[PDB]
Scaffold this active site. Structure first.
Site, PDB file in Angstrom:
ATOM      1  N   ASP A   1       0.578  -1.408  -0.134  1.00 52.66           N
ATOM      2  CA  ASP A   1      -0.252  -0.184  -0.416  1.00 52.66           C
ATOM      3  C   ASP A   1       0.512   1.021   0.490  1.00 52.66           C
ATOM      4  OD1 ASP A   1      -1.898   1.546   0.535  1.00 52.66           O
ATOM      5  OD2 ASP A   1      -2.371   1.273   2.232  1.00 52.66           O
TER       6      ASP A   1
ATOM      7  N   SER B   1      -0.829  15.825 -12.585  1.00 53.33           N
ATOM      8  CA  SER B   1      -0.831  14.982 -13.536  1.00 53.33           C
ATOM      9  C   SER B   1      -1.059  15.742 -14.652  1.00 53.33           C
ATOM     10  CB  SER B   1      -2.301  14.360 -13.859  1.00 53.33           C
ATOM     11  OG  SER B   1      -3.015  13.924 -14.523  1.00 53.33           O
TER      12      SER B   1
END
Length: 330
Positions: A35, A199
């Protein structure tokens, strides 16, 4: 040193991935959920409330000659899906794919929430976010990666998740056979303890690319792709009959649909998520309403590039002094 381990979807929907991890002496192998969105390595154990164990493999520290109680240390974690776990702490030898850390904090669960109990295939979590998020008190502990780092050939790990197929986590090297083209690296902020990056935009299907900054985290422990409501609405508007359902808890679409792809930007590079990766199947057994793999982040407080996005790429988690993230197509 290096390590290399195969990671395997837990079910036919890629709801999560498990990777075998050796703990203790003699080894006890548990299947952990790696994770990159948390920083605790915790396991089902001989100390876990019996009624909360349902098929998991447990770590038994009394059977490990290298286990030592970390006296006084406790931990307690609450995740963004509402699940939780807590317990006490041992140090022991932990190996992943041939890579060994001695003195690793292994957080032994005394209590786990129902979602963990109900997932018989996940024996615990191995956190790979920054150690500043580790919950051990009163002495915060380091992640497996943080402990391994100085010994690694290069201070990196990579995630290569499969779509309906096994993939790989590598530590300490970049497998240049595992991706196509070049790797594009992008800046990371560790201010919130995550692999947080921006992004450069998105496209829906064959549509034009929209240049827009989307701050989010690379989180292998989150199943879906959670993005701003504007972006998600633009995606689902291209699917006839798709709608956001408050009763189901997100966007659903007719199971008869052919889903468009979704592209996200990494600098000037582009990662394309095929439409099939966005299908999470019937909302309930036999339903003709299917659950979407792109969902709104509104109310979470952060955008999350979860497995839906990451499995479309070869992803480099660069833990150099100035951390960065790399993405390549594959």
């Amino acid at each position: 040193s290096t390590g290399s381990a195969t990671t395997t979807p837990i079910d036919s929907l890629d709801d999560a991935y498990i990777t075998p991890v050796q703990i203790g002496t003699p080894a006890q192998t548990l299947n952990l959920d790696f994770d990159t969105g948390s920083s605790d390595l915790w396991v089902f154990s001989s100390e876990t409330t019996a009624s909360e164990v349902d098929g998991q493999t447990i770590y038994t520290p009394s059977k490990s000659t290298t286990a030592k109680l970390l006296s006084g240390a406790t931990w307690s974690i609450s995740y963004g899906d509402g699940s939780s776990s807590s317990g006490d702490v041992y140090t022991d030898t932990v190996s992943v794919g041939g890579l060994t850390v001695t003195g690793q904090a292994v957080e032994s669960a005394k209590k786990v929430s129902s979602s963990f109990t109900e997932d018989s295939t996940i024996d615990g979590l191995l956190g790979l976010a920054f150690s500043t998020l580790n919950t051990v008190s009163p002495t915060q502990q380091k992640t497996f990666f943080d402990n391994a780092k100085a010994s690694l050939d290069s201070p990196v790990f990579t995630a290569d998740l499969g779509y309906h197929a096994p993939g790989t986590y590598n530590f300490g090297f970049i497998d240049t056979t595992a991706y196509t083209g070049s790797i594009t690296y992008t800046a990371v902020s560790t201010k919130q303890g995550f692999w947080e990056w921006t992004s450069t935009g998105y496209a829906v299907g064959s549509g034009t690319f929209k240049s827009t900054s989307i701050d989010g985290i690379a989180d292998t422990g989150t199943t879906l792709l959670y993005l701003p409501a504007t972006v998600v609405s633009a995606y689902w508007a291209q699917v006839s009959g798709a709608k956001s359902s408050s009763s189901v808890g997100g966007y659903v679409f007719p199971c008869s649909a052919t889903l468009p792809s979704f592209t996200f930007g990494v600098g000037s590079a582009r990662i394309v998520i095929p439409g099939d990766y966005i299908d999470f199947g019937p909302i309930s057994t036999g339903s003709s309403s299917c659950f979407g793999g792109i969902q709104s982040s509104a109310g979470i407080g952060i955008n999350i590039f979860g497995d839906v996005a990451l499995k479309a790429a070869f992803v480099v988690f660069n833990g150099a002094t100035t951390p960065t993230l790399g993405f390549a197509s594959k």
